Amino acid sequence: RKESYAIYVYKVLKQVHPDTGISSKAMSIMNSFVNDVFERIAGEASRLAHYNKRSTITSREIQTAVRLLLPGELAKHAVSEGTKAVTKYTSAK
Amino acid sequence: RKESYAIYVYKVLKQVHPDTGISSKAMSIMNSFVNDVFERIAGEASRLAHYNKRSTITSREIQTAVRLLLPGELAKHAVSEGTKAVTKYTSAK
Amino acid sequence: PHRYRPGTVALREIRRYQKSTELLIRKLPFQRLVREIAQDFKTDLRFQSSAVMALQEASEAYLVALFEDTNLCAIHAKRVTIMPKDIQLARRIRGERA
Amino acid sequence: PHRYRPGTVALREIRRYQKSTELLIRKLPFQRLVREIAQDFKTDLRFQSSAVMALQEASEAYLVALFEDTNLCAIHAKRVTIMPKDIQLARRIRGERA
Amino acid sequence: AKTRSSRAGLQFPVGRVHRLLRKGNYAERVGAGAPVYLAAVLEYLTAEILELAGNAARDNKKTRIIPRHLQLAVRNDEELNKLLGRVTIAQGGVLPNIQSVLLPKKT
Amino acid sequence: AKTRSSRAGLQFPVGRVHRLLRKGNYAERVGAGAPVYLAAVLEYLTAEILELAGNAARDNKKTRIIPRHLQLAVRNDEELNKLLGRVTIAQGGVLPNIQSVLLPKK
Amino acid sequence: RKVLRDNIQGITKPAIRRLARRGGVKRISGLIYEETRGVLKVFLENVIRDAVTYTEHAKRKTVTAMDVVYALKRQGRTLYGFGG
Amino acid sequence: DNIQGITKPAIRRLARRGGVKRISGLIYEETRGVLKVFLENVIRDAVTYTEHAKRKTVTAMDVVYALKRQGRTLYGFGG
DNA sequence: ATCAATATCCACCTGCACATTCTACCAAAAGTGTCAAAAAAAAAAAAAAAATCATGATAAGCTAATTTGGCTGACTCAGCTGAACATGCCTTTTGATGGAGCAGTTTCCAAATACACTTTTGGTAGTATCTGCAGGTGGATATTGAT
DNA sequence: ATCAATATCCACCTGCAGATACTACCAAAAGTGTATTTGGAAACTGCTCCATCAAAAGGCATGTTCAGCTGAGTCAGCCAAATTAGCTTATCATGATTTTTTTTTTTTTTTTGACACTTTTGGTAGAATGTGCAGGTGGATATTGAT
């Protein structure tokens, strides 16, 4: 088995466009996207730590990274959608 | 306490031109040269490592990483000394 | 006997291919040029059916995106005819040529 | 009386600085700017002489190269006057505007 | 029986985003809040693009997204474009455009 | 008085590399050869650099070596230049070059 | 088993032109048609060389697509669509 | 001011190194424009690096680390 | 070409600043002997995928020729810049004092990594079901270059 | 200002590839619970150094004028390379088969890291000696600009 987000995309996919379809050619370009973004962020994060003699990666780093790797309007929005997710989690269970 | 390659830069400077020094503003320019290069060859070696599922960087990686980074001829000699440095290490107590 | 004025096939032509997403370079002549060049690097090399297209999409897209960066140069000098002296610049500013 | 055909103390300056490494910027009209700017991001910001001195370098060296790239852009048009139009190009073909 | 994804409200796999965070060893300890926030940005960005992506499919009167759209959407969005400005979409073609002088004009 | 550096006959901190290599998280497990081979490539370049950088003081009579010494070398060397092509040396200046056309007679 | 040689010519003037439209080009010079080929030749050699280099490290004989892909990413020409 | 502090006959010093032939009028601004935008871009990423480290001052690294992620590297102050 | 009209490199230098020598100290570092984990190293063997091959079939490359138009070298006024230079502003640099701030440190909280155990899931797999976008066909519209 | 030949194209109809679902179920994966560690934070504060002056020295900026300039307007021959048809090759999509390369799993042989113990080092901080780089001063050499 090969891991993949072909579903977390699809779920999200309907949410925005309920009755729309997504080719194999494009779901791929998308699996290649989430992934690219991940590494990109997961890496600036990783880096910040080192930049600040820290051994842990935290929502404190993933943020500064998103703000670094994501441009304008997009970013301000991620940080947001993010913060939320966290907070709601830190109050889930 | 802070670190630096400074001394090993001199110890080697002291191997090509015993009749020469190095401006402090050329030392850092030589600290950053080195410091940098490492980070390159390393990650590229780190990726190499994580591309094959292997959990360990080896001399191999460093090579297939050096060959990947340094230019044409400046790459061949590189692979050389490297090998040597290594091959002398093996047989020497 | 009818024709089409100087350049009224091009403007036509362009428009044609700009809305498409199919590869131009023929698949075959390309693939050979591929195994030829990998050849003189490592003899006896096999290529995954795909990995070659990986190279074509890539190789293509590139070429397509350097013509662009070309007019923007010929055009800079009131011409509308792309020439080597052009490309060459596009590449030099692009920080390529060596 | 003796003047100078437009070229010399253009050239002997070229020749000059291209021969030099010193900064071509007064460490304040700049550093102030540098401070102006930052504020647009954060308040009561301090800058290690080390920092402002870096951007200074970077910032200049950068402008340098853009100029070379610029130059050709003009020369490309069979001129020698770095026109605004040039930059536009150069900075576009680089990626700064695409 | 309750995924962390539903714990935090997202959809992308929170744990997966965590595990991978390790298997890559971008750092020694992957905190507890990070993976969440991450899977969070990724969910956003995915929804952001699929939207401009679908709409593109709506225009081109199709009901099935195919790269051309993803491209069409990614190139036609100041932001996203700069995020993907060095990425190439396989099978995406370029943007319907032409220079002006090239245009045939003047009487 | 023997260190990996010594036995591998190396002048660079071949010892700390096995440290830096893991600290930087460029993995977990680090073989024992890599920490070396790395240093070597490192020592080589450093010299090969300073080298070309050295003859630069012989060219601009000064004995010591300041930035412009390095910078002048790199640029004037193919390989390096390529390798540094996107690195900027502080206090570097350019290269006495004038696209012909800019000089006198036409 | 047949000697491969001169396939940089399969990049026919036709196609070499077909691209150029998509690139938004109208009038195309003549020294052009070659100059292009020999650019593409340099492109391929820079990528293949890395692709092949990620193949040799893998103890492989088969240039996989990840190979290539990882080779484009490493060059500044990140590609989406072929796994990875 | 504070943008105009970048003196005209001085810009020409930088224009010099680049082997700038003559020069122009509308350039000086067009230029003042670039330089500015170049800055923002760096400073921003830096200022953001600064703020991750609960500081108020912007270190040398703070910049370096920016110039790197931004493509334009800089050897010399990494110490 | 000659000559005045205004600026560069060799050179002798020597003051002051800093590039280097030492002297000692240690806070962290590099190697050691040992022990137990695990990773690589190898290795016979199923599964997948690439090269090899036949084939009808051809639009797509080729290639000759005809020709509208961009490419290119030139005339020429003038908007534009270097150059030339003189009233004088604030950027440097010594030189300093002060106080914000980042850095060294000691302890504890809460956060995280590790093993225990349960079991939720997202992915391979044989399976069929289903639907759309590609490929043919008719012909409507807008373009186009000559009359 | 009409006209026919060309081609883009609005919608339509239809059939197999491609996308959608059904469904069991696996091992990897992720949740859950508990012992155990420790990362870095809240707190105290020493030592770096960033900000703000005021001094002084003058250079580098600024604002006007002057002519030589080459950038931009302008036209027009040669000739580059658009284009449109005349033929036949090399590509391709069908279709499958051959054989070799990569992937699955499994044994043991080697390599590494961590644990607690020696011993080695390269920064740290003054103090300190010595070497030469700054830059500046003497000047014929130097380029170029009008006679």
Delimit the domains of chain E by residue range. Answer: 1-107
Question: Which bin fits G36, alpha (ψ -120 to 50), beta or left (φ > 0)?
Answer: alpha
Find all residues with CB under 8 Å of D12, minimum gap 6, and list them. Answer: none
Q: Method of determination?
A: X-ray
Token readout for D21 is 């490494």
Find all residues with CB under 8 Å of G8, minimum gap 6, and list them. Answer: C33, C36, G37, G38, G40, G41
Of E25, E26, E27, the CB nearest to F28: E25
Please report, in angstroms and rounded to a whole number, the separation of the first and last CA atoms in chain G: 32
Of B21, B30, B86, the CB nearest to F33: B86
- CA atoms of C72 and D76, how far apart (whole Å): 12
Please report all neighbours of C, defined by 3+ CB atom pairs within 8 A: D, E, F, G
- CA atoms of D61 and H4, how far apart (whole Å): 19
The chain H residue lying nearest D53, using CA atoms, is H60
Residue with token string 């023929």: C26
Q: CATH number of F1-106: 1.20.1300.10, 3.40.50.720, 1.10.20.10, 3.40.50.12280?
A: 1.10.20.10
Three-state DSSP state, B78: helix
Chain F nearest C-alpha distance from C6 (Å): 35
Task: Give the residue from F79, F53, H64 showing the smallest Cα distance to B36.
Answer: H64
Q: Do C80 and E92 touch (CB under 8 A)?
A: no
Of E87, E90, E102, the CB nearest to G26: E102
Main-chain dihedrals φ then ψ at residue G62, nearest 5 degrees: -105, 105
Domain E1-107 belongs to what topology? Answer: Histone, subunit A (1.10.20)
Exposed / middle / buried, residue G58 (Cβ in 10 Å: 0-12, 13-18, 19+): middle
Find all residues with CB under 8 Å of C33, minimum gap 6, and list them. Answer: G7, G8, G10, G11, G41, G44
Task: Give the residue from C95, C90, C34, C45 showing the smallest Cα distance to C66.
Answer: C90
**Nucleotide of closest approach to H59 (CA, C1'):** I102
Please report, in angstroms and rounded to a whole number, the separation of the first and last CA atoms in chain B: 33
- CA atoms of G51 and G64, how far apart (whole Å): 8
DSSP conformation class of B58:
-
Chain I footprint positions (protein CB, under 7 Å): 4-8, 18-20, 27-32, 38-40, 49-52, 60-63, 68-72, 80-84, 90-92, 100-103, 111-113, 119-124, 132-134, 144-146
> One-letter amino acid identity for E81?
N
> One-letter amino acid identity for E42?
L
Determine if strand I comes within 7 Å of the CB of E14: no
CATH of the domain at A86: 1.10.20.10
Task: Give the residue from F1, F5, F87 showing the smallest Cα distance to F42.
Answer: F5
Exposed / middle / buried, residue D33 (Cβ in 10 Å: 0-12, 13-18, 19+): buried
Exposed / middle / buried, residue E99 (Cβ in 10 Å: 0-12, 13-18, 19+): middle
- CA atoms of F72 and F94, how far apart (whole Å): 8
Q: Which long-range contacts (CB under 8 A, 24 or more apart) does A60-64 make?
A: A60/E33, A60/H52, A61/E27, A61/E34, A61/H52, A62/E34, A62/E37, A62/E38, A62/E41, A63/E37, A64/H48, A64/H49, A64/H51, A64/H52
CB atoms within 10 A of CB B86: 23
Find all residues with CB under 8 Å of H21, minimum gap 6, and list them. Answer: D10, D71, D74, D75, D80, D81, D82, F102
Expressed as residue numbers, the domain containing A77 is 1-93
Task: Give the residue from D55, F87, A83 showing the smallest Cα distance to H47.
Answer: D55
- CA atoms of C77 and C74, how far apart (whole Å): 5
All residues of chain E having their beta carbon less than 8 Å from the beta carbon of residue A39 are 24
Find all residues with CB under 8 Å of D35, minimum gap 6, and list them. Answer: D45, D47
Q: Which CATH architecture has domain C1-98?
A: Orthogonal Bundle (1.10)
- CA atoms of G39 and G51, how far apart (whole Å): 18
Q: Does F86 touch chain H (CB under 8 A)?
A: yes
- CA atoms of H34 and G33, how far apart (whole Å): 36
CB atoms within 10 A of CB B76: 11
Tally of structural domains, chain A:
1
Chain F nearest C-alpha distance from D58 (Å): 7
Task: Give the residue from D1, B91, A27 showing the smallest Cα distance to G83.
Answer: A27
For C80-91, letters b (16+ CB in 10 Å) and e give bebbbebbbbbb
- CA atoms of G79 and A29, how far apart (whole Å): 9
Delimit the domains of chain C by residue range. Answer: 1-98
- Report CA-CA distances (Å) from F3 to C93, E79, F29, F90: 49, 53, 20, 36
**Run of H or E including B77:** helix B72-90
- Ordered by where they begin, the domains of chain H are 1-79 (1.10.20.10)
How far is residue B14 CA from its own chain's centroid?
Answer: 18
